[PDB]
Amino acid sequence: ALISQSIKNLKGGISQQPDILRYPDQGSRQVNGWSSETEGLQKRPPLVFLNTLGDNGALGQAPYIHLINRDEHEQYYAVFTGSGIRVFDLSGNEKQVRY
Amino acid sequence: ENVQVLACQSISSDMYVILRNEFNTFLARISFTKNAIDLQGEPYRAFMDMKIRYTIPSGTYNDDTFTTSIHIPTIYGANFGRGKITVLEPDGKITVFEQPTAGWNSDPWLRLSGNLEGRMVYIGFNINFVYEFSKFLIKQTADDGSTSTEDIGRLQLRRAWVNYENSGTFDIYVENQSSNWKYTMAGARLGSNTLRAGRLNLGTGQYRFPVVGNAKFNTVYILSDETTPLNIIGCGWEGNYLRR
Amino acid sequence: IKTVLTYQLDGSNRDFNIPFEYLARKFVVVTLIGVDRKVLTINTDYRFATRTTISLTKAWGPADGYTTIELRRVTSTTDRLVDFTDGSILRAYDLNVAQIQTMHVAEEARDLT
Amino acid sequence: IKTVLTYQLDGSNRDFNIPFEYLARKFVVVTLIGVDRKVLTINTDYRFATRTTISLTKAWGPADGYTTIELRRVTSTTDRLVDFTDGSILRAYDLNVAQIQTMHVAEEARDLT
Amino acid sequence: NVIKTVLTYQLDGSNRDFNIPFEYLARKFVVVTLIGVDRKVLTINTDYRFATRTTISLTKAWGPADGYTTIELRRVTSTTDRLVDFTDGSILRAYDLNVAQIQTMHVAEEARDLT
Amino acid sequence: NVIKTVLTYQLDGSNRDFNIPFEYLARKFVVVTLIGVDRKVLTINTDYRFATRTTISLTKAWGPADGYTTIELRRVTSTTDRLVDFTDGSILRAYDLNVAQIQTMHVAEEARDLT
Amino acid sequence: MRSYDMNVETAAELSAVNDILASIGEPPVSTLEGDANADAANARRILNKINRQIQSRGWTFNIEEGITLLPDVYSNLIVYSDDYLSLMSTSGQSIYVNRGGYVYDRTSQSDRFDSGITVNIIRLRDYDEMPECFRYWIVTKASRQFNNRFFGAPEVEGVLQEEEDEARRLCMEYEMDYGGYNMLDGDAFTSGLLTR
Amino acid sequence: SYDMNVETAAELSAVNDILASIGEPPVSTLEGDANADAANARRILNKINRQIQSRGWTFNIEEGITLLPDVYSNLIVYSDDYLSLMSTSGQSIYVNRGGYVYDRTSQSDRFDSGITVNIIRLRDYDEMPECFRYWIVTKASRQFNNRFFGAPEVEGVLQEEEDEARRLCMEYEMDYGGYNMLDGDAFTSGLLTR
Amino acid sequence: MRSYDMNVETAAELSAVNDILASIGEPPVSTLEGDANADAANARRILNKINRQIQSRGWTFNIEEGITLLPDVYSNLIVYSDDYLSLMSTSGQSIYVNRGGYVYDRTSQSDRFDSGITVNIIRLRDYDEMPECFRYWIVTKASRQFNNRFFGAPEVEGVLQEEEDEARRLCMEYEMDYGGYNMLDGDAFTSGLLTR
């Protein structure tokens, strides 16, 4: 019957449902993919490098991290080690905390 | 792999995420701007997963062996784990270095070739953008948001095509029950105006690849690694579909 | 100009002129002939005074029986100066050296025959 | 590292490994030695259980004097594994195998000297 | 074993046309010489012409006269001169790429055959 | 009443090929011996060969001479060795399940027939 | 009749299955053992029954003239296995028929035989061990049924039927070349007449 | 410079004609990453090449070549290379049984001193006449679209071309054979002698 | 075979490519060298294939009668290159076949030749170096395939079919005029009969 069809959206996203039950443009899986508005499927943004915070164990094994946005010039992380606090600027520089 | 994402936090326009390797902890930002390049130079806004505008020091090059060697712990904070690092020149040139068995720990030197004495190269890893298209079946959307698939009958699909804009190389894996196929789409093509040497080589086009099978047992998934944007603006397929 | 050549040792003659073109220093190999084949390290045993000339630091003379010094250019087939990746541009400089690197290996074969 | 090498049979051994890298099975040419230069159909007479290891498939034997086997890699210069046609997508793969073929052809010629 | 690049034809009297089996990158690479007294390399302008890509025509009738028993036809590929050069403005095409490897592959042909 | 697994063919002179009607799980299970003087079990490598699945070819032409009057063809199915083994990773298939059922079916044939 | 998987794979059978799968449009399969492909399994089932059928028709190489069937001396009755596609007497009138899997003499009303019989048997062979000219006809016939049974496409169906007719024509052309039948001297009756 | 005499690889160029028969862009290489159409076209090209040779042509049949058994086993091997095996005169006796030459009349698969037969042996896509090489490609091109991707108008022309291609190869064999009903044939030649 | 871009451009080939392009409806191309036109490249590939095929059929000017092929005296074996479209003996029965790219004497089972051989050869020529009457047939056939492969339009397809049939008729008409074959005196057999 020479049937063909084309899809323009692919906004979709991963669906675990059966292929029969999947909406058109869902797709079985996508990794590192960005489904950006009208624009098509894209690679995720590149994650540019900023300063390394420290050693692997410098932060806690399971830390609590809360970004601070006070000013357009001052932004910070308040990352909580299991014991103690560390505070870095978004530039990567570490601002020492005194208790 | 072996990388833990401690916290992703987003300022209005871009998101700053810190993630730990088995040796280090890093800070990095993911910027969601529509077209803007992240770094100065940077011919086409490369996707390198850790981007630095490195300048190679004068002590790196030696003449006894032609290779110019660069030390990863100096360019970054310190040594990494397992990954494929791409070095990208101020122009389009790319050199990719396979992950050694020790994994960049015992061997932290990446050796370019020739005199890259003081170059503005960009050094970064790779991202494996995988997308699996799901099955290709007769799907009609009806009643304002309900799609029904014609389960009755057998579809023998002949081929498929993917439309891309300002996109580089990518591989369209087609995997039937028995065997698998790749169909790498790299360049413009040998007689094309675009393939002109020294030109950035990425452009808009349609790629049609032969996909044959039962339309129900063969999986078509696209993926790419080679540090070049990939924007997929369409997809399609052709089939016979005798109903029985 | 032959890619392979042997020079009369001429006693304590430190330096020797090599006329053939070579893509890289590591490709040029220096051997001593007269008793057995001897391979010399690039940097400790000899030194490249310039690109055109080469000088032996230790002046292995007509002594121990070595009477001639052989200078030949061998281009490694496994080692390639330029390699092509699916991404990236294909600069004309890369395509030219790939052409001449494999030409050098073939030219070495013709001169030996 | 050398493409040309010879294995002595060393008893009825079915398996011999080839150190040199090669592109296609057809390129590797093998001859039995010991009485007269005998060429054999590589595909029918030998089965590649692995890429490096050939199989005599039974104990050819030092008996009868065929106690020597020669391993040679002759990559066909007339038949090019990859030739570029206008209208075909340029790739890293085809450029790489195109280079490694001519570097294999040059290397085989150089070792023949 | 067979020598593809180099082959000799018995003159057997006056024969104008000789066929060249080997492929050649340029007409300057094919060299023709008579054999029997001295290796006399023929000039392309007047001594011998082609009239066909695979055939060469010789003006005079050598045959058994002048002591030249046979004719020698071989191809020598110039190492120093490169047929194809790549420039940034240039568009890559099948012609430029195929010449790059195959010219080198011809040089290795001569070395193997001369051995 | 009929003995399917065990059957003997009169040699009647030089007859090279004999038909094996019973189904057998392996060529090692089918055992062939000449009768008339002693039970001489033939080796599979050289003495006799399976030209086809159902036909055996005996190299020498026996017959009454050699005091071997007849030929005896029977199958013995090995109890200890199992043709099919099941592992967790491996896919179940019709071949695997049929062999398991039919092997112990074969062994019951010999017990019933030898009785 | 045996299971399709029971036949050992060969290069000839691998290409035949690939050709059958190509009819509906499935891609070729690399190896036959250890696959989960349902279509590849069917192609071997269709190939085996077409192979068995085409062999059943009397062919010169297929028919064996005057072969001797030996009975078990103790049992005294010959086994008429399913391997024998046809069992006919050498003379004009055939007197052997199947009764309970054993050769039975209808004119004698006895299935017990002594000293053996001489017959003409068509015996089954693999897909290999078959004349090459017949291999394409087996595939071409098997392609038609495989297309018909699973994915019936009228466009490919018409081409295959034309291809089968040409394939059958060549196979007869093979038999006439193979047979070399002579109507004067090869003929049974005419040979005695030409005696002079 | 166009003085060059370089020729491209015939096997790939044959595949490209199969791909180009529908308008698909040519493939730069055969070996490498698996490609469905390149794998399909190459297989059909060898499939069709094997078919066309099996039919039998004056150059194809090798007359009176001897097949020698192994000295110890006394068996001849009927390899997959042998496309046909027929006796020289008539009523061909040798067949295949278990991969070995079997003499149906004598009911013995063991021979000594060899046998004389007429064998059609497989050849590459090359080593075939230009008349036949075009026929194989145009036959494989028609088989390509019929099976895998069907274009109605393409098959119509490729059907016409294949008939024309088939006709030309017959004229080749008839010209190659030069068969003579007066002197060439076995029977009438003896009658003509006077 | 050989690459399309290998052949040097000439005015004859430039018009032939333009005519093939027009069959679909593409505008003519000014020059062949240094263009990015994919259709122009295809038209040359289609033209070269049809050029080789139409030459392959035996024509009087194409066929060379009794030309001598000389072997390498050292090698002793003649080269059977792909440029040789057909190789036939001058006598009735042709004895030369191709084995491994070298001329092989099937009756002699030897490919080693001395003193050369006399044969009938069809040798490939360019699109130029061809009779004018044949040039329009090559184009007409090529445009038929070029239209079929890339842009298959039934309306233009039917017109090209009769254009090719007329083109073939004229080419045969050219061949008969070129040949000047005489059935009384030019004939090999009949000439010997006419002696008086």
Concatenating the DSSP letter of every residue in C35-100 gives SS-EE--TTTTEE-SSSSEEEESS---SGGG--EEEEEE---SS--S----SSS---HHHHHHHHH
Residues of D in contact with H26 (CB under 8 A): 85-88
Interface test with F, best of G64, G67, G75 (most F CBs within 10 A): G75
Instruction: Determine the distance in angstroms separating the CA of E41 from the nearest CA of chain B, rounded to an integer.
Output: 40
Alpha carbons H99 and G12: distance in angstroms, whole number? 12
Structure token pair of residue F36: 């008339």
Residues in contact with H95: Cβ distance below 8 Å, sequence separation at least 6, in sequence order: G61, H85, H101, H102, H103, H104
Q: How far apart are CA B226 and CA B214, in angstroms?
A: 31
* Token pair 């192609």: residue: G43
Dist. CA D11–CA C106, nearest whole Å: 38
The b/e string for I31-52 (b: 16+ C-beta within 10 A; e otherwise) is: ebeeebbebbbbbbbbbbbbbb
For E44, which DSSP code? T
What's the token pair of residue D107? 């290397």
Nearest CA in chain D to I38: D87
Q: B197, E92: Cβ pair inside 8 Å?
A: yes
Q: Does E3 touch chain I (CB under 8 A)?
A: yes
Residue I10: half-sphere exposure toward Cβ, Cα within 13 Å: 10
Q: Can you name the residues that pair with A42 across neighbouring β-strands?
A: A34
Chain H's closest residue to D97, CA to CA, is H32
Q: How far apart are CA I74 and CA I114, in angstroms?
A: 10
Q: Rounded to a whole number, what is the distance in Å from the CA of B235 to chain A's nearest CA? A: 5
Closest CA relative to residue H118, chosen from H181, H77, H57: H57
CB E91 within 8 A of CB E53: no
* Residues belonging to chain I with any Cβ–Cβ distance to chain H shorter than 8 Å: 1-3, 6-8, 42, 45, 49, 52-53, 56-58, 82, 85-86, 88, 91-94, 97-101, 106-107, 122, 144-145, 148-150, 152, 154, 157
- Partners of A95 in beta bridges: A87
Q: How far is CA B161 from the centre of its chain?
A: 19
Chain E within 8 Å of H183 (Cβ-Cβ)? no
Angle of helix H130-147 relative to helix H36-54, nearest 10 degrees? 130
E46 touching B (Cβ < 8 Å): no
Q: Give the pair of three-digit tokens for residue B7.
A: 């916290």
Cβ distance of B197 and E90 shorter than 8 Å? yes
Q: Is G16:G4 a contact under the CB 8 Å cutoff?
A: no
Check H33 against B210: CB less than 8 A apart. no
Q: Which residues of C touch E85 (CB under 8 A)?
A: 96
Whether B197 sits inside 8 A of E94 (CB atoms) is no
Could you say which of B212, B242, B244 has the minimum Cβ distance to residue G26? Answer: B212
First to last CA, chain G: 52
Q: How far is CA A34 from the centre of its chain?
A: 11
Question: Which residues of H are less than 8 Å from F27 in CB distance?
Answer: none
> Which pair of structure tokens corresponds to residue I122?
């069809």
Task: Write C9-14 long-range contacts (CB < 8 A, 24+).
Answer: C9/C34, C9/C61, C9/C62, C9/C66, C9/C67, C9/C68, C9/C69, C11/C61, C11/C62, C12/C59, C12/C61, C14/C55, C14/C56, C14/C57, C14/C59
- Closest residue to B191, CB basis, from D87, D92, D93: D87
Q: How many CB atoms lie within 10 A of CB A35?
A: 18
Chain H positions with Cβ closer than 8 Å to B = 25, 28, 33-37, 40, 148-150
SS3 content of chain E, % helix, strand, coil (to 5): 20, 25, 55
**Any idea how long chain D is?**
113
Residue with structure tokens 């089965």? D47
The rounded distance, in Å, linking the Cα atoms of H183 and H191 is 9
Whether residue H90 and residue G19 make contact (CB cut-off 8 A), yes or no, is: no
**Contact between residue B162 and residue B210 where contact means Cβ atoms under 8 Å apart:** no
Contacts of residue C113 in chain E, CB cutoff 8 Å? 110-111, 114-115
Q: How many Å apart are CA E6 and CA E18, to the nearest integer? A: 13
- Asked whether D and I share 3 or more beta-carbon pairs under 8 angstroms, the answer is yes
Measured between alpha carbons, how far is residue H16 from residues A79, B155, C25, H23 in Å? 62, 28, 44, 10
Per-residue H/E/C for B175-218: ECCCCEECCEECCCCCCCCCCCCCCCCCEEEEEEECCCCCCCCC
Which of D84, D87, D89 has the CB atom closest to B185's CB atom? D89
Single-letter amino acid code for the residue at G147: N
Chains A and B touch (3+ CB pairs under 8 A): yes
Decide: H75 and H110 in contact? Cβ < 8 Å: yes
Q: In 3D, which of B9, B1, B45 has the Cα closest to residue B27? A: B9
Other CB atoms within 10 A of residue I66 CB: 10
Sorted by sequence, the CB contacts under 8 Å of residue B168 that are 6+ apart come out as: B201, B202, B224, B226, B228, B229, B230, C87
Note whether B148 and B70 are within 8 A (CB): no
Residues 6+ apart with CB under 8 A from B151: A20
Residues from chain D that touch C84, judged by Cβ atoms under 8 A, are 92, 95-96, 99
Distance (Å) from the alpha carbon of I37 to chain D's nearest alpha carbon: 10
Please give the Cα distance from B185 to B194 (Å, whole number).
15
Physical contact, C and D (3 or more Cβ pairs within 8 A) = yes
In DSSP terms, I118 is beta-bridged to: I68
Residues in chain B: 244
Q: Do D104 and C77 touch (CB under 8 A)?
A: yes
Chain C contact partners (≥3 CB pairs within 8 A): B, D, E
What does DSSP assign to residue F84? -
Query: Determination technique for this PDB entry?
Result: cryo-EM
The whole-angstrom distance between D59's CA and the closest CA on chain C is: 34
Residues from chain I that touch E8, judged by Cβ atoms under 8 A, are: 72-74
B193 in contact with I, Cβ within 8 Å: yes
Q: Is G79 exposed, middle or buried (0-12, 13-18, 19+ CB in 10 A)?
A: buried
- Burial class for H78, CB neighbours closer than 10 Å (0-12, 13-18, 19+): buried
Chain G nearest-CA distance from B70, in A, is: 45
Q: Is residue D76 within 8 Å of D27, Cβ to Cβ?
A: yes
Q: Note whether D28 and D18 are within 8 A (CB).
A: yes
Mutation pick from E88, E90, E92, E97 vs chain B, by most beta carbons of B within 10 Å, is: E92
Place of tokens 């700053």: B16
| Phi, psi (rounded to 5 degrees) for H97 | -140, 105
Please tell me if residue D89 touches chain H, with a CB cutoff of 8 Å.
yes
Half-sphere exposure of E80 (CA within 13 A, CB side): 5
* Contact call for residues I115 and E12 (beta carbons, < 8 A): yes
Helix, strand counts (H, E) of chain E? 1, 7
Q: Minimal Cα–Cα distance from G191 to chain F, Å? A: 32
> Min CA distance, B185 vs chain G (Å)?
21
Residues 6+ apart with CB under 8 A from E33: E39, E40, E41, E42, E71, E72
Amino acid at E32: V
CA-nearest of A78, A40, A31 to A59 is A78
* Cα–Cα distance for residue pair G126/C48, rounded to 1 Å: 73
**Alpha helices, DSSP H, located in chain A:** none
For chain D, first and last CA: distance in Å?
16
- Within 8 A by CB and 6+ apart from H15, the residues are H27, H30, H38, H41, H42, H45
Question: Is C in contact with G (3 or more beta carbon pairs below 8 Å)?
Answer: no
Which 8-state DSSP code applies to residue A15?
A: -
**Amino acid found at A11:** K
> Closest by alpha carbon to F29, among F67, F68, F82, F70?
F82
- Whether residue D11 contacts residue D48, with contact meaning beta carbons closer than 8 Å, is answered with no
Query: Cβ H109–F57 below 8 Å, yes or no?
Result: yes
Determine the distance in angstroms separating the CA of E107 from the nearest CA of chain H, rounded to an integer: 14
Dihedrals phi, psi of F36, to nearest 5 degrees = 140, -35
Q: How many residues does chain C have?
A: 113
Collapsing DSSP to helix, strand or coil, D72 comes out as strand
Contact C103 E103 (CB under 8 A): yes
| Dihedrals phi, psi of I54, to nearest 5 degrees | -65, -35
Pick the residue from chain E with its C-alpha nearest to D109: E112
Count of C-beta atoms within a 10 Å radius of residue H106: 11
> Which of G25, G35, G151 lies nearest to residue B178, judging by beta carbons?
G35
